[PDB]
Amino acid sequence: DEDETTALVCDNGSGLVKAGFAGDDAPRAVFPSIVGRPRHQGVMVGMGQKDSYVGDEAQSKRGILTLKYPIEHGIITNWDDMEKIWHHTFYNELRVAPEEHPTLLTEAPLNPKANREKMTQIMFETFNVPAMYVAIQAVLSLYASGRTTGIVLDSGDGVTHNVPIYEGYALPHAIMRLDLAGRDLTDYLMKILTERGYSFVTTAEREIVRDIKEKLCYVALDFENEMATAASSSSLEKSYELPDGQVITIGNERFRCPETLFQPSFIGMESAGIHETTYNSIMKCDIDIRKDLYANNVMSGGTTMYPGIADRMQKEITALAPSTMKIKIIAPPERKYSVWIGGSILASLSTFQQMWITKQEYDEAGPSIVHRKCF
Template identity: 45%
Template sequence: MEDDQLTVVVLDCGSSTVKAGFSGEDAPRAELPTLVGHARHPGTTGVMHGNPSDVFVGDQAASRRGLLETTEPITRGAVTDWDAMQHVWHHVFFDSLKVACEEHPALVTESPDNTRLDREKMVEMLFESFSCPTAVVANTATLSLYSTGRSSGLVVDSGAGRTHVGPVWEGYLMPHFLRRIDVGGDDMTDLLRDKLRRDGYPFSTAQDRMEVARIKEDLCYSSLNCQRELTYCKESRSIERWHNLPDGQQVFMNEHRFTVPEALFAPELLGASFKGTPALHTTIHEAIQMCDPSIQAELYGAIVLAGGNTLFPSLDERVQREVAALAPSGTTTRAVAFPDRKYAAWLGGSVLGSLRTFPSMWVTKNEYDDYGASIVHRKT
């Protein structure tokens, strides 16, 4: 089989979920929690649940949280437990996708500010632990832009653990102008959980937190004018909605629906530890202003939202409005939010892996053997 006919395995590993599938497809084949669980008493819990290895990954671990010691391998977009990460990849390759790793090139996403050492570790694992024939590590900002058919734009990649704001020009991320905000979807979930607790809802367990995340995804939206809407809420209950819990109870939401996403524009709402954290709209403006003046207008006109934490309805309108207020007079500002933006990085990887030029980007096993893992920096 010729190289350009090989199907590439595409892995997008985030703080919350892993998306996995094959190049050329329009959706990942598998999506699972980035979670690993170990039996508290080796040799007992695993066998009891039909898993003699005592290691549970993804949904297997999430559904048994109360019985296991669990680990989240990725924190704020960075791998913090490589052994657990290897368990996740093993599960994805062999259980979710059911592939022979030695027969497929692999493309793995990385955070835009990933360290050189961690990039090398990714390549080392793909070759040493999984015997992949070739490997590519690609940053999520550029891939997210590819998923929209663009090669230039300002990417706002906001996932569970962090938000990156990065200018991409003609297919290349401009790392010196990349900005990171340590605010993500998990912070929004925790904020909503705290608000609901104050309202009398007893959300305390890990399973409860997962339900709060579902409430957030179901009912929250970005307000175009938070203060005006707060005033309106005092006069009317027309925006009140409810969420049905598995036990039949209902959770009622009024102003929480929009005050939670408001934390993207006012991070201090998340608590004292977030005081001084930059707001999303000011970070976008500052990142663009650092770029060469000749490309700034195009970046203002192509602000691309990506990642699960950008799914709040009307967020694109709010971003566009706030950035327009900061941009130079006469500048056209446009923020775009495609329906499948939760999977933007994976979809970009699917597109990239389908290109005839893709083999020029990969590291081969022979190159790895000859030069070591550092060869990846010449191809990234």
């Protein structure tokens, strides 16, 4: 089938499956991490109509399905559904046999270890890969940045990290994990669109709210004067055509969605915000690291494609950090993919080929071997 030993870089952070080959620019198979299930009976005889719809095919039929993300906040909930996602990933979209290729998974730090361990157990026992590795999402986000020094903000669909790394060495004590991410912003956006007058309650309607969040939101550099501006005039009211008919027109909801990311008191989650978890992750580091963390602050995962979020980020960290510091919020426009791109780089290095957790070494010490080889 395949005449190569190219490593597979499979990457489900929490909300969007992206996969491909090692040593490649763009991820080959990008599709949402959903499994579908018909919530009512079928009538037409002779249709096919299996009781599983995974990936973008589920979004073709999302009107008649109960959509269900199998992984939540980076934690895999239903292992059978995630096995459907992986089966559709390798066998249908990417269309390659896992038996002949090493695999490079990704996860979050501060993960429940049964996710990592059972993920390795499914990768070796079911799909029978020859090699396997459990990559950290944020470190790979620093691999695609072309740097070896920087603090990493990625903020995927269910997790954000702010992992500081200095000169090839990470700082595991200064690590962070906040559970405020894009799915919570989608639920809050659904709540405030219910406040305006557009009632979205279905999971398919929740997917439409995610579409409105992706297309039509920005970050509000100064939230107070932007709030008074939205209360002032209708220069911020924007119409978005929903699928099948009625258009919407959003005002202050256009920028109160990512302000929740910068201020978690709107969603009532006790936290300090993104800009203070960065500053706290810098202040937990030592004294002689911090200007290298200021000049190389990376903001290159998902949920950062809101326009001007680097201006709010630099404008706020400048207010937090002491003066005469050069706050460089590195936002390369290739983000939302840079964790896969760092997967492609790290899977294509020459030094990495003796760090593979491989079979006959998996079977030697069982599934706990990941906690002694990987990290």
